[PDB]
Amino acid sequence: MKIRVADEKELPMILQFLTEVKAYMDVVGITQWTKDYPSQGDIQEDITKKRLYLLVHEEMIFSMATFCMEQEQDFVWLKRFATSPNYIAKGYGSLLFHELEKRAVWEGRRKMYAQTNHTNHRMIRFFESKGFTKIHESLQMNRLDFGSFYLYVKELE
């Protein structure tokens, strides 16, 4: 608390954070992320591209998400959205989410895309509760073992 873009200097923190979240996810039995996704290359690129936001205070990341707003485009993409297991109960994921939705709304966007693995029921419920709708299924490269990923769209206003 509060929310801002991530500095190159914090990757450090964000790799640590990603490791806690992967550990949680796969104890829970969610087959989504791996050793290599998200990897350093992924988050460097997002920092570089002014793309990755943090819910943060001092040196403590509560939640993070990469938000794709593209040049003269109609839509946005929520990707690699994750909250620290310690802070899920407080609902900080929802804070980070509603702020990003706000940004897209009077940047004029009218569609928001997001994705989860079929085993991620928390996140499936989350998107449904935010008014997303499942519209497609697909495999992901370098993650074929995990099977179906679901695509969600929310009409923005």
Side-chain angles (χ1 to χ4, degrees), residues 21-35:
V21 164
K22 290 179 210 200
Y24 167 87
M25 269 161 32
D26 82 70
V27 164
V28 161
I30 290 165
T31 61
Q32 185 143 320
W33 293 343
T34 71
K35 200 192 218 310

Side-chain angles (χ1 to χ4, degrees), residues 1 3-4 10 13 54-57 59-63 87 92:
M1 353 306 281
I3 298 162
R4 33 153 281 242
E10 289 166 302
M13 286 155 55
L54 269 40
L55 214 210
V56 71
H57 175 272
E59 232 160 315
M60 175 159 57
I61 301 159
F62 301 112
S63 185
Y87 301 103
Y92 289 176

Side-chain angles (χ1 to χ4, degrees), residues 121-133:
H121 296 93
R122 170 224 179 351
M123 205 55 79
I124 284 173
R125 286 183 211 113
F126 183 92
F127 294 142
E128 287 182 352
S129 80
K130 298 321 189 193
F132 286 74
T133 318

